[PDB]
């Protein structure tokens, strides 16, 4: 999220290098007509479109029942099998927690997301804090994110690392600025509360792609909006 003097380093075709090249070019030229026709923008567009979004791996430490565990997820389909009490839902909530910060930074930067509830920390005596970390790979671009919370009553601090998500979300906002109908990734979560979402105001006249970005979960009024959209 900086202009920088474009340090040469060595030749590469990374998406980040194209992002920096465009930022450096923008700081000099003022006419938007020339900017919209620059070859750097075309290269950035092509690289962004070719990349396929998919999560790579995840690890959990001292969160709910799970003590220490690391999973690697496929790129098309993955299924978890177990009986009751084996933390099948816990993994899903961990992924939702991680994805919420990415959702938040797209609408507007430096906006907080979802934290860890105080009762979700492990109940063992020797535990001190809980941490969740994850990695997102865009073909050849790798980002990582850590979320953590300290147990109540302790007097030692911990922080979150949000540089990767902020940097990745800045690219999406920049490309959205110069493209009329740029696409955005899809994120959704169908919890167990959907059973009565379908089981169970001022008229809307304006729709937009950011309407689906208000929340990451599906519940209640979303069903009503579907009828009004149809």
């Amino acid at each position: 999220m900086w202009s920088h003097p474009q340090f040469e380093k060595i030749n590469k075709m990374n998406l980040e290098t194209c992002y920096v090249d465009f930022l450096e070019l923008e700081s000099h030229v003022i006419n938007e007509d020339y900017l919209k026709e620059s070859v750097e923008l075309q290269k950035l567009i092509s690289t962004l479109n070719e990349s396929k979004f998919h999560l790579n791996k995840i690890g959990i430490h001292d969160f709910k029942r799970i003590r220490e565990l690391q999973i690697s997820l496929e790129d098309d389909l993955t299924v978890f099998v177990g009986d009751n009490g084996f933390g099948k839902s816990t993994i899903l909530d961990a992924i939702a927690i991680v994805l919420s910060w990415l959702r938040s930074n797209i609408e507007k930067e430096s906006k907080p997301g979802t934290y860890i509830k105080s009762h979700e920390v492990n109940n063992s005596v020797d535990v001190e804090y809980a941490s969740i970390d994850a990695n997102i790979k865009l073909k050849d671009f790798n980002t990582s994110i850590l979320i953590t919370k300290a147990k109540e009553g302790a007097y030692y601090s911990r922080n979150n690392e949000l540089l990767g998500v902020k940097k990745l979300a800045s690219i999406y906002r920049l490309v959205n600025k110069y493209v009329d109908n740029a696409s955005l990734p899809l994120m959704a979560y169908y919890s167990i509360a959907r059973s009565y979402i379908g089981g169970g105001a001022k008229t809307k006249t304006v729709w937009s792609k950011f309407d689906v970005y208000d929340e990451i979960e599906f519940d209640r009024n979303d069903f009503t909006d579907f009828f009004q959209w149809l």
């Binding site: 009751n84 009490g85 839902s89 009762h119 109940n123 063992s124 167990i192």
Partner: protein
């Protein structure tokens, strides 16, 4: 909570003249009133009802402590993984504590599966106890149940 309070009072005893103590509490409330009005009158009537209940003192074979044990063992029959269930009083409130393995859990930390069974069985037993206060074993009444 009420069942546990009655069981604790019966088991610990030391109530002495419980009916007289409740009547004295009612008299103190009336004196304070002489020295919101409808609520105070209702509370005084509740104190009189408590005095009448203590004066009665059925102390039947199916006492409060026996019903409490039967209810807890009834729920524990359906959940073999757990060990014991207790009602812990702290911060001027009551909370349910369950022990699984070596970790104690609150009510809200259980999974959906044990939540369903705990709710359904507890609601089954509550109505049987309330509807049949005369039988020695209250889990023998008649009825019809529809489950989907």
């Amino acid at each position: 909570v009420f069942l546990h309070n009655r069981a604790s009072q019966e088991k610990l005893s030391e109530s002495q003249t419980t009916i007289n103590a409740l009547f004295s509490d009612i008299q103190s409330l009336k004196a304070t009133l002489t020295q919101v009005i409808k609520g105070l009158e209702l509370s005084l009537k509740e104190k009189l009802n408590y005095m009448k209940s203590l004066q009665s003192g059925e102390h039947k074979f199916n006492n409060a402590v026996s019903l409490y044990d039967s209810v807890i063992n009834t729920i524990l029959k359906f959940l073999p993984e757990f060990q014991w269930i207790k009602l812990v009083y702290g911060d001027d409130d009551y909370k349910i504590i369950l022990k699984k393995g070596e970790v104690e859990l609150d009510i809200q930390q259980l999974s959906q599966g044990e939540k369903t069974i705990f709710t359904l069985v507890g609601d089954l037993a509550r109505r049987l106890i309330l509807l049949n206060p005369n039988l020695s074993n209250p889990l023998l009444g008649y009825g019809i149940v529809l489950i989907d």
